From a paper:
By using a flavin transferase and carving a flavinylation motif in target proteins, we demonstrate that “dissociable” flavoproteins can be turned into covalent flavoproteins. Specifically, four different flavin mononucleotide-containing proteins were engineered to undergo covalent flavinylation: a light-oxygen-voltage domain protein, a mini singlet oxygen generator, a nitroreductase, and an old yellow enzyme-type ene reductase. The crystal structures of the designed covalent flavoproteins confirmed the designed threonyl-phosphate linkage. The elucidated crystal structures confirm that the covalent attachment does not significantly perturb the binding and microenvironment of the redox active part of the flavin cofactor.
Except for introducing a threonine residue at the respective positions, analogous to the engineering of PpSB1-LOV, the 6 residues before each site were also mutated to carve a recognition site for the flavin transferase into miniSOG as was done for the LOV protein (47-DAASGAT-53 for miniSOG-F1 and 51-DIVSGAT-57 for miniSOG-F2, respectively). To analyze the effects of covalent flavinylation on the structure of miniSOG, miniSOG-F2 was crystallized. The asymmetric unit contains two miniSOG-F2 domains. As observed for the LOV domain protein variants (vide supra), the structures of miniSOG-F2 and miniSOG are very similar (rms deviation on Cα atoms of 0.55 Å). The mutated residues of 51ATVQKIR57 to 51DIVSGAT57 are clearly visible in electron density. Electron density clearly confirms the introduced phosphoester bond between OG1 of Thr57 and the phosphate of FMN. The isoalloxazine group remains embedded at the same position in the protein. Only the angle of C5′–O5′–P is different and is bending toward Thr57. The phosphate group in miniSOG-F2 is further stabilized by the guanidino group of Arg41. The interaction in miniSOG with Arg57 is not observed, as in miniSOG-F2, it has been mutated to Thr57.
Residue numbers in the entry:
A (entry chain A), B (entry chain B): 2 to 110
């Protein structure tokens, strides 16, 4: 299944309001464990903070970006998360949601 | 002039959407330079990260806080910023804006 989430940047700290079954499977968290949280909950000691701070600034500026960073499953297993973030805008062009796709790393070294 | 800003936590990363003339004067930045930025842009090498972390936790949790931390004017001059951050709620009690007041540090030693 594709792993993706939908966040609402019109709510405080841009929480996840929808998580695909692929995301549950990739992360090992349940839907109850995920919803209402900011995506950074997957991050941990080895995550690159310069990439994180860079993504924060890009997201504030409503840019579409791709980043690759270390995340952790619920049980503490590290994985490379190739994460594509895209604003979704309403009919008038105003930001409504962000879509985050956790892309497969199979052909990514 | 009193120095303050209004941020919008219903836009990603709580950007500054209004800056008082006193804030322009305190920081040396222009209105154009400031709007759309997160307040953290004033921070720099000597800012205390434990205080930053503390503020960030309170803000994400929609709480009122007062902090004191080192900031930098546009030209690189350090000043102590005694910063009071307050949620502003709508008629129903839902978070609408944050007000951040940069209080005068004259009688704060």
């Amino acid at each position: 299944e594709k792993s993706f989430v939908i966040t609402d940047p019109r709510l405080p700290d841009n929480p996840i309001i929808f998580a695909s079954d692929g995301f549950l499977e990739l992360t090992e968290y349940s839907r109850e464990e995920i919803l209402g949280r900011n995506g950074r909950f997957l991050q941990g000691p080895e995550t690159d903070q310069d990439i994180v701070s860079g993504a924060t600034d890009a997201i504030r500026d409503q840019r579409e970006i791709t980043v690759q960073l270390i995340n952790y499953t619920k049980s503490g297993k590290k994985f490379w998360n190739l994460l594509h973030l895209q604003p979704m805008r309403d009919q008038k062009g105003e930001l409504q949601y962000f879509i985050g796709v956790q892309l497969d790393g199979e052909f990514i070294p």
